[PDB]
């Protein structure tokens, strides 16, 4: 029997909003340490990893490890039925056909109970990338979302350049080009540059990642020459939601 | 001549917002006791009845009885031109070919005057259904709107079960199922339940979600359920009347 | 080098918001006196005149006079990238193929920089109708916008009537007709020197009111033998004026 009670149910609400536009189906890995989810988007240039530690929950019981195949569009629909202050309890039997979600209103005349059907998913084992930390940018999550939104008007790809304690985002298209330069100062921008890095990413996928913005005031960019970019959002006390993105490749000279 | 002055004009604004989705053309029955409207909705599934009592207007004069054919979409468009604080006056001569709507801003330096062409309608003649009151639920209208919108993500129909202390709303569909249980409350945030005989009834969420467009008219909604007669979903308008929606529990 | 620094960047955001649906491409004339723009709209029905005086800028430099061909759609998209509190700087070389737009945020650690290609424009000159002031109406810009939006549901044209009484807006159409009567009073001012009654296309008025964010008030200047003038005062820097000939 798996049962987990989360007092701030909005966390779960926001997590599904941040996943659903990116991936349809995913396998939720449940165990004694908590909830873990890993999946790629359909064209496999992008990976998502979610961690919710058992201690972040107000109640946590996991008798046996589960892998729940979940239609995320379905689960998103159910979670839109929970209010922002609701207490949410997940519950599942030992070889799970269905996942139960219970929503309790903050003052208690109202209780909702949903039964979500689980699906069958092919799981292909994914290497989570080795992390090199060549440059690390911590900044406000809104500002990062706004940068990505802005440069989408200019072009479809952003060049991220990290150099001696400044970072620059660049784009170009038929109307012209632009760039946004951030310098070092919950309003703080911090740039930590161990080796300079310059890479090109698809704005389409960065704009999906920023659907996670409501989970945190700050976002961390981890960029390295040799690895996918990491975009990370800390979730409360519980864990994180991390997005990995391969650099766009390049033309040949 | 018919003339009615209504100080809270936002009432008519809200009434038209609540009807315009549901109904294209309808007849407004004007009499000295007030304004009455009865229609099947445009898909001929649910029945709508509107009541505005003459007492609720600041000024009311009706010389002879009118039946006004109204395009509600037109009337809706005209009423979007009224401010929420406007005093609205309705006026029609007895050869009733146009309806006039006068909007006075409260600072008396703006006045709008619209003349709506009336329509010639072949009105379906309708009785209002027998009401049986097996079960009556009063609840916050927003909560009821929220419940219907939610469940419509799950399934196409809600099953309403009622017992003495509590009411349950259920739906089910391909993705799974759900239910929302409301307990009776210890003023307009209360859920009160009068259960005279138990009831378990199924209704189309699509039609319920049209009904809840009347939510702006009242902070509470009343559900009147019976096994043998149409469900009544009812919104009290100020002190002057009601907007009621009817939906059959069976095809019978 | 042309260079102009504007502390309230929102002024340019709003000005492009107000022009971009009306005009696809237009000519920006740069002088020592300031920025000037004159264009017919896409359909060659109304005339737009924009004036931003050099005095209004925190920094202004014009070495040689410029006429910059500008795609308003492109310049609009770029100004979507400035924050409302951003400080905006315009820069061009003297034979300018590109215009630069620099956005500095209030927290002084973000700076954005944009280069727009300039259009090769066959630049008209039109001439500005001289104004008679038979009637002048001053009212809240919001009220005026709501009047034109409202009357659009009724009909495609509005009849504007001015008497010392007040001003009346009328429209007539398939579903019926309506009028709105304003009287002298967030104030409504009516200078009526000579009575005017004229008919305008609501399509164009609903475009003009895209300028509403620029001012809490709009001025209508009406006269029998000239275009209607719809004017929005910009800060203290200048105005955005729209001109529309009546229907016959």
Swiss-Prot record, chain C:
Phosphorylated. Phosphorylation at Tyr-204 by EGFR stabilizes chromatin-associated PCNA. Acetylated by CREBBP and p300/EP300; preferentially acetylated by CREBBP on Lys-80, Lys-13 and Lys-14 and on Lys-77 by p300/EP300 upon loading on chromatin in response to UV irradiation. Lysine acetylation disrupts association with chromatin, hence promoting PCNA ubiquitination and proteasomal degradation in response to UV damage in a CREBBP- and EP300-dependent manner. Acetylation disrupts interaction with NUDT15 and promotes degradation. There is a cross-link at residue 164 (Glycyl lysine isopeptide (Lys-Gly) (interchain with G-Cter in ubiquitin)). The modification Phosphotyrosine is found at residue 204. It holds the Pfam family PCNA_C. Keywords: Acetylation, Deafness, Disease variant, Disulfide bond, DNA damage, DNA repair, DNA replication, DNA-binding, Dwarfism, Host-virus interaction, Isopeptide bond, Methylation, Neurodegeneration, Nucleus, Phosphoprotein, Ubl conjugation. NCBIfam families: pcna. It is found in: Nucleus. The gene is PCNA. This is Proliferating cell nuclear antigen.
